[PDB]
Amino acid sequence: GENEEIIGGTALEYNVEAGPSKFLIGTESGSILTANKKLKKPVEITTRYGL
């Protein structure tokens, strides 16, 4: 939206069966984000697990 706060990436998870697409990232605030790397747009933060 407009509210952009930079929150510390406390944990990162990556697996073969998930593939090189998805990177599952945990934060200080308690939420969990997912960064799908693209050859298109340099990076995208798709899902927001527990907003």
Partner: protein, 48 residues
């Protein structure tokens, strides 16, 4: 520790310090300037 303390107060919102905002805005500029400074400082040591 003060520079880190101010950031976590903004994250929890509740309340904020008086006239410590000016230190926190420039905070980023100090963390470039301290590294930048360092650069030279080192070199001096290993130069001496």
């Amino acid at each position: 520790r003060l520079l880190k303390e101010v950031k976590y107060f903004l994250l929890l919102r509740l309340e904020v310090p008086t006239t410590a905002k000016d230190i926190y805005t420039k905070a980023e500029t100090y963390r470039t300037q301290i590294v930048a400074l360092d650069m030279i400082v080192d070199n001096y040591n290993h130069i001496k």
